[PDB]
Amino acid sequence: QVHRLLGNKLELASTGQTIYHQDINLNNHPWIGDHRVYDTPVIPGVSYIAMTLAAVGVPAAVEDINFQQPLFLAESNTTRETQLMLHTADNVGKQFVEVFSRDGAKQEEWQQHASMSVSENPPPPPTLSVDIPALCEQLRPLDTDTLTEIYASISLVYGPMLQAVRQAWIGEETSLLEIEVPKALAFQLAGEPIHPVLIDACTRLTPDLFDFSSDSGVFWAPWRVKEMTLSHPTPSRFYAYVEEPSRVNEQLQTRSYDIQLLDETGQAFGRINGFTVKRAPSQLFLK
Amino acid sequence: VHRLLGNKLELASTGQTIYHQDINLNNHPWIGDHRVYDTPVIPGVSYIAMTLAAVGVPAAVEDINFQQPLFLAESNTTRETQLMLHTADNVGKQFVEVFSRDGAKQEEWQQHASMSVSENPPPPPTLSVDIPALCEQLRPLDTDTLTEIYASISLVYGPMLQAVRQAWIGEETSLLEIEVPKALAFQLAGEPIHPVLIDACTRLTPDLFDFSSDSGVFWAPWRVKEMTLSHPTPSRFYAYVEEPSRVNEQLQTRSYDIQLLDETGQAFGRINGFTVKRAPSQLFLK
């Protein structure tokens, strides 16, 4: 049989590797059609973290995450033969993970989309608490339309199956997102710790989101993530909390930030460290 | 899904190919007709047939080794099997491994075979034999006589393994006429050579009586130096052995060579250094 997110599991007798293989298209994964960059369905990078977390189970920690070329679906019927390769643990006990795809029909050359390592060490148990009704009493709520325009300004549009942001708050130094399972997406969930969309939603706000120079049309593509930890599956409703404004590297041209995942009570249960985006014009990005 | 190889998966990362399938009496009823110690077992040469099906003929396969056999203990036993075709190396040879594990118990993987696909295939056959002229100077042999020898090493060929139409024997040479068993016919699927047919080529040598029929202990295929095949087997062909089996007292082995000859008597394949070794039931089926 076959997991909705990972596809088919194959354990390699020779190596002790594990391959998860599936055919990705809008039939299998209609949600991609609602994550549109330059009006092209594209899989956001954090999806591969989601997949890896689904393969190894939580609690888990994933480190040195890199995104190469995006997996995009040019045409309505485009199928990409996709493979997530989970390597056999090394001497330090780390598991290397890599995600490749090639076009189904044409039988093209394999393109890599992601690499990362599963840490040999379970993250240490979450320490940061938060009083949630107090945060929403010292911040100032956002109109979601204001955010939609910012995304549209960098050629990003979130369709019905990506609209997971219930409410947004902003301060001068901090930001907070209230995140839930989009009604359109609900049917597609399959007991994976965190769906690609939900982890993507965590990355949608920073104290200084009005700063991300808009007037060019050029997209900010996720490029690397230092560390991502998750202690348990996401609840039906949770929060994404950013404590400091994004760090802007100039000479190497990247914006980076941190996100704390907080449950219903305001208890931390996951985090994303060093979430880095880089400018990617459509000529370079779309391949 | 190819009936013989199962499902093909090409690895993105390495350029390797995995053929994976569930082996059982349902998928492969013929195994039930190759019984050693009254246990359905896959003959070693099957994995050569599999490899030949993966890469195509003409082809040569070298340094073939058989480890633990794949056997089906119970009538419903399923073993998930994987044939791994490695990406070609510097010399351009492709390493091949066959593993299985129990479908139910999810035990540890057991290896059944390893071999290398040669960088370059055999040259188009030129040499040829006159079959009737060879048969005019060989003593025909009754099949019952052979069935008894196999039974004495705890080997029994059922209807789907009964590929030997006729057998001849001389002092120095042996000859087998081989055809597709009527019970097996429907299972063939365009593979160059079916496990059964390659197995049948190994069933006679000029000195077959000198195989110890005394304790019921089986002679298990252990290694093969080279196996070459130029084209798919015709519906009827011959297996020719030119010299008596070489016996290694010390290593406890018997080894021999088999020439595969078509309907006209033209050679189109061979098996070199086909080695059997004594394998008692306690060691063999465990």
XYZ file of C-alpha atoms in Angstrom:
573
model
C 0.000 0.000 0.000
C 0.915 3.728 -0.052
C 1.155 6.740 2.265
C -0.491 9.878 0.832
C 2.571 12.012 1.595
C 5.557 9.687 1.152
C 4.296 7.223 -1.456
C 5.661 3.699 -1.561
C 8.220 2.440 0.934
C 11.080 0.253 -0.280
C 13.761 -1.139 2.027
C 16.988 -1.902 0.198
C 18.365 -5.277 1.092
C 21.911 -4.422 -0.017
C 22.493 -1.127 1.822
C 19.853 -0.787 4.547
C 18.575 2.291 2.737
C 14.930 3.271 2.418
C 13.377 4.803 -0.696
C 10.008 6.475 -0.696
C 8.816 6.724 -4.291
C 5.662 8.239 -5.783
C 4.366 10.108 -8.793
C 3.639 13.710 -7.902
C 0.958 15.607 -9.809
C -2.195 17.663 -9.199
C -4.259 14.468 -9.042
C -2.175 12.935 -6.257
C -1.443 16.234 -4.540
C -4.035 18.863 -5.506
C -2.656 21.169 -2.790
C 0.394 22.072 -4.892
C -1.971 23.792 -7.320
C -2.793 26.213 -4.510
C 0.867 27.093 -3.792
C 1.539 29.275 -6.824
C 4.816 31.105 -7.474
C 4.849 33.072 -10.760
C 1.438 31.457 -11.332
C 3.166 28.049 -11.370
C 2.325 25.251 -8.930
C 5.520 24.745 -6.911
C 6.358 22.580 -3.876
C 7.739 24.788 -1.106
C 11.057 23.532 0.310
C 9.791 22.882 3.845
C 7.628 20.050 2.400
C 10.687 17.832 2.291
C 11.249 18.412 6.003
C 7.630 17.341 6.478
C 8.301 14.199 4.436
C 11.460 13.309 6.329
C 9.694 13.821 9.649
C 6.967 11.512 8.349
C 9.587 8.870 7.483
C 11.469 8.810 10.801
C 8.671 9.877 13.178
C 8.729 12.476 15.971
C 10.297 13.548 18.252
C 13.068 14.258 15.742
C 15.553 16.912 14.717
C 16.586 17.710 11.143
C 19.758 19.627 10.412
C 21.739 21.189 7.525
C 18.713 21.445 5.247
C 19.298 22.747 1.719
C 16.935 23.378 -1.162
C 18.264 23.205 -4.695
C 15.960 23.550 -7.723
C 12.191 23.585 -7.045
C 9.820 20.788 -8.044
C 7.272 22.619 -10.218
C 4.335 21.454 -12.320
C 4.425 23.388 -15.584
C 1.272 21.930 -17.104
C -2.021 20.810 -15.555
C -1.118 17.165 -16.286
C 2.612 17.229 -15.465
C 3.741 14.178 -13.478
C 7.069 14.111 -11.693
C 8.514 10.773 -10.603
C 9.767 11.610 -7.101
C 12.176 9.778 -4.773
C 13.102 10.534 -1.171
C 16.216 8.575 -0.241
C 16.860 7.908 3.455
C 20.406 6.711 3.892
C 21.566 4.112 6.353
C 22.800 5.717 9.598
C 26.508 6.565 9.686
C 29.148 6.220 12.435
C 27.759 9.225 14.336
C 24.303 7.721 13.736
C 23.079 10.510 11.429
C 20.825 9.657 8.458
C 21.397 11.578 5.238
C 18.245 12.368 3.232
C 17.954 13.513 -0.372
C 14.955 14.248 -2.610
C 15.144 13.802 -6.391
C 12.596 13.977 -9.198
C 12.472 13.581 -12.977
C 9.646 14.093 -15.484
C 7.393 11.051 -15.714
C 6.774 11.005 -19.468
C 9.985 12.247 -21.189
C 12.285 10.289 -18.848
C 14.597 13.280 -18.271
C 17.708 13.526 -16.062
C 17.167 13.458 -12.291
C 16.951 16.840 -10.548
C 17.680 17.261 -6.855
C 15.329 19.376 -4.763
C 16.542 18.856 -1.200
C 19.210 17.451 1.120
C 19.365 17.198 4.916
C 20.471 15.112 7.888
C 18.291 13.530 10.519
C 20.099 14.204 13.811
C 21.163 11.133 15.840
C 19.966 13.073 18.868
C 16.323 13.572 19.764
C 15.895 17.275 20.488
C 15.954 18.206 24.169
C 12.380 18.565 25.553
C 10.795 22.013 24.866
C 11.475 24.625 27.549
C 9.874 27.887 26.346
C 6.341 28.545 27.628
C 4.053 31.522 26.729
C 0.833 33.099 28.079
C -1.182 33.299 24.866
C -4.102 35.605 25.845
C -1.506 38.149 27.080
C 0.414 38.140 23.779
C -2.803 38.938 21.903
C -3.446 41.733 24.420
C -0.094 43.511 23.849
C 0.127 43.030 20.086
C -2.125 44.479 17.359
C -4.102 42.115 15.043
C -3.616 42.169 11.265
C -6.011 42.231 8.357
C -4.998 39.174 6.302
C -5.585 41.130 3.070
C -2.554 43.289 3.940
C -0.446 40.107 3.985
C -1.976 38.666 0.785
C -0.860 41.808 -1.042
C 2.716 41.467 0.229
C 2.864 37.890 -1.075
C 1.285 38.924 -4.382
C 4.009 41.589 -4.544
C 6.662 38.885 -4.585
C 4.601 36.782 -7.054
C 3.262 34.424 -4.360
C -0.411 33.402 -4.080
C -1.860 30.997 -1.523
C -4.970 29.162 -2.752
C -7.783 27.607 -0.603
C -5.691 24.550 0.326
C -2.817 26.733 1.576
C -4.897 29.246 3.556
C -3.911 27.961 7.001
C -3.394 31.351 8.646
C -6.453 32.020 10.807
C -5.114 35.194 12.474
C -1.954 37.316 12.419
C -0.450 39.705 14.979
C 2.524 42.071 14.660
C 4.773 44.012 17.038
C 7.923 46.054 16.498
C 10.163 43.210 17.683
C 7.881 40.130 17.547
C 5.276 38.412 15.319
C 2.611 35.737 15.888
C 0.541 33.545 13.532
C -2.506 31.480 14.520
C -2.488 28.398 12.290
C -5.209 25.798 11.608
C -5.895 23.009 9.071
C -7.469 24.621 5.974
C -10.976 23.221 5.453
C -10.102 22.403 1.823
C -6.998 20.490 2.948
C -8.513 18.436 5.825
C -9.239 15.313 3.677
C -5.637 15.008 2.504
C -4.068 14.614 5.941
C -2.788 11.113 6.759
C -1.400 11.037 10.296
C 1.924 12.583 9.316
C 3.355 14.759 12.162
C 3.114 17.963 10.098
C 1.800 18.506 6.588
C 3.935 20.546 4.141
C 1.278 23.308 4.117
C 1.218 23.615 7.918
C 5.003 23.852 8.178
C 4.972 26.332 5.305
C 2.437 28.484 7.128
C 4.902 28.872 10.008
C 7.272 30.766 7.750
C 4.793 33.358 6.494
C 5.435 36.199 8.991
C 8.280 38.186 10.526
C 8.188 41.424 12.641
C 9.464 43.202 9.499
C 7.426 41.609 6.682
C 6.566 45.033 5.188
C 10.326 45.447 4.624
C 10.865 42.562 2.170
C 11.248 44.887 -0.871
C 8.011 44.367 -2.788
C 8.068 46.595 -5.884
C 10.204 44.225 -8.010
C 7.927 41.153 -8.350
C 10.920 38.911 -7.610
C 10.268 35.943 -5.280
C 12.049 35.160 -1.992
C 12.843 31.414 -2.255
C 13.711 29.291 0.794
C 17.376 28.351 0.422
C 18.508 26.630 3.623
C 17.423 25.840 7.189
C 19.992 25.309 9.948
C 17.796 23.154 12.204
C 14.182 22.057 12.517
C 12.890 20.164 15.548
C 9.464 18.778 16.311
C 8.528 16.995 19.558
C 5.053 15.734 18.602
C 2.378 16.019 15.891
C 0.793 19.445 15.364
C -2.560 19.981 17.093
C -5.598 21.121 15.058
C -4.724 24.687 16.071
C -1.302 26.118 17.022
C 0.904 29.216 16.790
C 4.065 30.380 15.016
C 6.101 32.828 17.092
C 9.024 34.965 15.868
C 11.012 36.682 18.641
C 13.421 38.884 16.638
C 13.378 40.637 13.210
C 14.969 38.873 10.225
C 18.753 39.067 9.876
C 19.798 40.476 6.517
C 23.093 39.332 5.056
C 24.092 41.900 2.441
C 27.289 40.644 0.766
C 25.875 37.084 0.481
C 22.302 38.416 0.056
C 19.967 36.344 2.277
C 17.258 37.021 4.872
C 17.210 34.577 7.804
C 14.942 34.084 10.828
C 13.657 31.785 13.595
C 10.201 30.403 14.316
C 8.889 28.835 17.514
C 5.949 26.444 17.237
C 3.575 26.853 20.198
C 0.537 24.673 21.005
C -2.992 25.701 22.164
C -1.753 26.530 25.697
C 1.304 28.414 24.432
C 3.801 25.617 25.125
C 6.629 25.182 22.619
C 6.721 21.834 20.786
C 8.846 22.576 17.716
C 11.148 25.161 16.164
C 12.745 26.230 12.893
C 16.207 27.809 13.187
C 18.043 29.784 10.525
C 15.185 29.733 8.004
C 16.893 31.440 5.075
C 15.263 32.918 1.971
C 17.114 34.199 -1.101
C 16.026 36.286 -4.103
C 15.093 34.067 -7.055
C 13.938 35.674 -10.331
C 11.620 33.555 -12.499
C 14.217 32.949 -15.263
C 16.555 31.282 -12.741
C 13.867 29.816 -10.436
C 11.600 28.176 -13.062
C 14.639 26.390 -14.256
C 5.160 -6.368 -13.564
C 7.375 -8.903 -15.369
C 6.441 -12.427 -14.193
C 10.117 -13.343 -13.608
C 11.685 -10.121 -12.313
C 8.757 -8.364 -10.691
C 8.742 -4.566 -10.437
C 11.551 -2.428 -11.809
C 12.705 0.601 -9.873
C 15.491 2.841 -11.084
C 17.342 4.637 -8.294
C 17.634 8.361 -8.828
C 20.635 8.760 -6.598
C 22.996 6.007 -7.742
C 21.803 4.784 -11.157
C 21.136 1.330 -9.704
C 18.158 -0.848 -10.556
C 16.102 -2.903 -8.121
C 13.733 -5.656 -9.187
C 11.397 -6.503 -6.351
C 8.636 -9.064 -6.045
C 6.865 -11.380 -3.625
C 7.952 -14.970 -4.280
C 5.408 -17.653 -3.373
C 3.669 -20.733 -4.830
C 0.934 -18.443 -6.117
C 3.218 -16.194 -8.168
C 5.686 -18.952 -9.053
C 3.939 -22.362 -8.911
C 6.960 -24.029 -10.576
C 9.039 -23.728 -7.392
C 6.683 -26.275 -5.824
C 7.885 -28.745 -8.460
C 11.586 -28.314 -7.630
C 11.729 -30.146 -4.289
C 14.906 -30.769 -2.308
C 14.291 -32.690 0.972
C 10.591 -32.436 0.048
C 10.888 -28.633 0.308
C 10.156 -26.238 -2.560
C 13.511 -24.558 -3.240
C 14.730 -22.145 -5.960
C 17.681 -23.629 -7.901
C 20.708 -21.317 -7.905
C 20.842 -20.961 -11.713
C 17.470 -19.139 -11.502
C 19.276 -15.968 -10.494
C 21.408 -16.200 -13.616
C 18.164 -16.447 -15.619
C 16.840 -13.389 -13.736
C 20.002 -11.386 -14.400
C 19.903 -12.388 -18.079
C 16.327 -11.118 -18.213
C 17.306 -7.805 -16.634
C 20.175 -6.947 -19.021
C 19.165 -8.901 -22.138
C 21.113 -11.235 -24.424
C 23.769 -11.534 -25.837
C 25.332 -11.406 -22.387
C 27.988 -12.997 -20.197
C 27.747 -13.504 -16.444
C 30.872 -14.190 -14.379
C 31.936 -15.009 -10.778
C 28.544 -16.454 -9.810
C 28.093 -17.503 -6.182
C 25.193 -19.149 -4.393
C 24.784 -18.639 -0.631
C 21.724 -19.783 1.368
C 18.840 -21.128 -0.754
C 15.452 -19.450 -1.006
C 13.033 -22.105 0.211
C 9.304 -22.072 0.895
C 8.758 -23.965 4.167
C 4.954 -23.800 4.227
C 2.470 -23.806 1.349
C 1.664 -20.138 2.016
C 5.216 -18.874 2.685
C 5.991 -15.601 0.917
C 9.458 -14.163 0.676
C 9.919 -10.583 -0.445
C 12.792 -10.782 -2.907
C 15.142 -8.133 -4.332
C 17.579 -8.419 -7.232
C 19.949 -5.460 -7.143
C 21.691 -4.461 -10.394
C 24.588 -2.171 -9.520
C 25.624 0.762 -11.648
C 28.482 -0.168 -13.980
C 31.989 0.372 -12.587
C 35.265 1.662 -14.130
C 35.777 -1.631 -15.973
C 32.103 -1.398 -16.994
C 31.003 -4.513 -15.122
C 27.708 -4.560 -13.218
C 27.548 -6.280 -9.856
C 24.344 -8.226 -9.081
C 22.969 -9.420 -5.701
C 19.826 -11.330 -4.794
C 18.350 -11.057 -1.279
C 15.097 -12.093 0.351
C 13.384 -12.047 3.745
C 10.160 -13.530 5.088
C 7.087 -11.473 4.180
C 5.377 -12.215 7.507
C 8.091 -12.302 10.228
C 10.065 -9.337 8.793
C 13.277 -11.226 9.657
C 16.752 -10.117 8.539
C 17.623 -10.154 4.821
C 19.334 -13.312 3.579
C 21.528 -13.390 0.474
C 20.983 -16.062 -2.155
C 23.316 -15.057 -4.959
C 25.942 -12.669 -6.268
C 27.507 -12.278 -9.729
C 28.935 -9.861 -12.264
C 27.594 -9.019 -15.687
C 30.616 -8.937 -17.984
C 31.550 -5.653 -19.676
C 31.321 -7.308 -23.082
C 28.904 -9.995 -24.406
C 29.951 -13.268 -26.095
C 30.879 -13.229 -29.814
C 28.234 -14.525 -32.267
C 28.276 -18.359 -32.137
C 30.283 -19.982 -34.964
C 30.849 -23.570 -33.772
C 28.305 -26.313 -34.422
C 27.676 -30.038 -33.724
C 25.952 -32.811 -35.703
C 23.301 -34.031 -33.250
C 22.219 -37.258 -35.021
C 25.854 -38.212 -35.629
C 26.543 -37.607 -31.957
C 23.461 -39.678 -31.077
C 24.611 -42.500 -33.391
C 27.666 -42.993 -31.130
C 26.012 -42.443 -27.735
C 24.029 -44.874 -25.611
C 20.426 -43.716 -25.025
C 19.416 -43.539 -21.365
C 16.024 -44.234 -19.747
C 14.560 -41.318 -17.762
C 13.473 -43.516 -14.817
C 17.150 -44.361 -14.235
C 17.900 -40.663 -13.816
C 14.827 -39.952 -11.633
C 16.161 -42.579 -9.212
C 19.580 -40.923 -9.016
C 17.965 -37.585 -8.173
C 15.683 -39.247 -5.608
C 18.798 -40.755 -4.009
C 20.193 -37.263 -3.400
C 16.752 -36.192 -2.124
C 15.890 -34.317 -5.334
C 12.546 -34.603 -7.155
C 11.451 -32.801 -10.304
C 7.690 -32.234 -10.567
C 5.646 -31.710 -13.791
C 6.741 -28.060 -14.207
C 10.428 -29.039 -13.992
C 10.238 -32.083 -16.286
C 12.044 -30.433 -19.213
C 14.261 -33.364 -20.174
C 12.706 -35.008 -23.215
C 15.599 -37.428 -23.934
C 18.989 -38.318 -22.435
C 22.092 -39.935 -23.954
C 25.309 -41.079 -22.281
C 28.792 -42.105 -23.390
C 31.973 -42.916 -21.494
C 33.369 -39.416 -22.022
C 30.345 -37.320 -23.085
C 26.664 -36.715 -22.189
C 23.715 -35.152 -24.029
C 20.292 -33.873 -22.923
C 17.375 -32.957 -25.210
C 15.487 -30.147 -23.491
C 12.027 -28.675 -24.193
C 9.534 -26.436 -22.359
C 7.442 -28.579 -19.993
C 3.783 -28.494 -21.007
C 2.807 -27.572 -17.438
C 5.258 -24.624 -17.489
C 4.429 -23.196 -20.955
C 1.849 -20.618 -19.738
C 4.305 -19.007 -17.278
C 6.910 -18.002 -19.855
C 7.092 -14.268 -20.612
C 9.788 -13.539 -23.186
C 12.740 -13.967 -20.811
C 15.831 -15.284 -22.708
C 15.908 -18.440 -20.537
C 13.574 -19.587 -17.766
C 15.095 -20.814 -14.469
C 13.687 -24.288 -15.190
C 15.356 -24.528 -18.609
C 18.753 -23.368 -17.368
C 18.359 -25.809 -14.458
C 17.692 -28.692 -16.843
C 21.076 -28.114 -18.563
C 22.874 -29.081 -15.364
C 21.131 -32.420 -14.865
C 23.596 -34.813 -16.546
C 27.324 -35.555 -16.710
C 29.141 -38.627 -18.064
C 29.889 -39.687 -14.470
C 26.505 -39.057 -12.825
C 26.421 -42.416 -10.978
C 29.610 -41.470 -9.080
C 27.629 -38.826 -7.177
C 27.238 -40.199 -3.627
C 23.729 -41.730 -3.592
C 24.488 -43.363 -0.231
C 23.195 -41.075 2.539
C 20.512 -39.099 0.696
C 22.596 -35.926 1.044
C 21.953 -33.326 -1.664
C 24.512 -31.824 -4.082
C 23.864 -28.065 -4.003
C 25.112 -25.701 -6.737
C 27.782 -23.555 -5.098
C 29.443 -21.471 -7.813
C 29.704 -20.957 -11.574
C 32.752 -19.377 -13.195
C 31.089 -18.131 -16.379
C 27.718 -18.391 -18.084
C 27.243 -17.021 -21.605
C 24.064 -16.788 -23.712
C 23.933 -15.465 -27.286
C 20.172 -15.483 -27.877
C 16.867 -16.723 -26.345
C 16.442 -20.505 -26.037
C 14.427 -22.116 -28.843
C 11.469 -24.357 -27.974
C 13.819 -27.342 -28.152
C 17.598 -27.439 -27.631
C 20.441 -29.591 -26.264
C 22.844 -29.639 -23.313
C 26.229 -31.152 -24.144
C 28.941 -32.162 -21.668
C 32.312 -32.984 -23.291
C 34.334 -34.169 -20.264
C 33.568 -36.024 -16.985
C 33.113 -33.882 -13.855
C 36.284 -32.724 -12.086
C 36.336 -33.887 -8.443
C 38.122 -31.960 -5.674
C 38.667 -34.347 -2.729
C 39.760 -31.519 -0.392
C 37.248 -28.756 -1.272
C 34.525 -31.469 -1.432
C 33.250 -30.251 -4.810
C 32.372 -31.591 -8.244
C 32.594 -29.225 -11.230
C 31.775 -29.430 -14.948
C 30.972 -27.609 -18.206
C 27.835 -27.502 -20.323
C 27.488 -26.457 -23.952
C 24.033 -25.208 -25.039
C 23.242 -26.308 -28.615
C 20.221 -25.315 -30.758
C 18.033 -27.578 -32.962
C 20.714 -27.735 -35.717
C 23.499 -28.459 -33.230
C 24.926 -24.938 -33.220
C 26.242 -23.638 -29.900
C 24.497 -20.522 -28.565
C 25.416 -20.588 -24.875
C 27.622 -22.200 -22.264
C 27.994 -22.780 -18.528
C 31.603 -23.011 -17.348
C 32.827 -24.335 -14.007
C 29.400 -25.337 -12.740
C 30.246 -26.470 -9.203
C 28.110 -28.510 -6.811
C 28.917 -29.121 -3.135
C 27.481 -31.560 -0.587
C 24.783 -29.919 1.532
C 23.093 -31.916 4.335
C 19.512 -30.914 5.234
C 20.485 -29.451 8.633
C 22.917 -27.008 7.011
C 21.013 -26.521 3.733
C 17.519 -25.682 5.028
C 18.709 -23.471 7.882
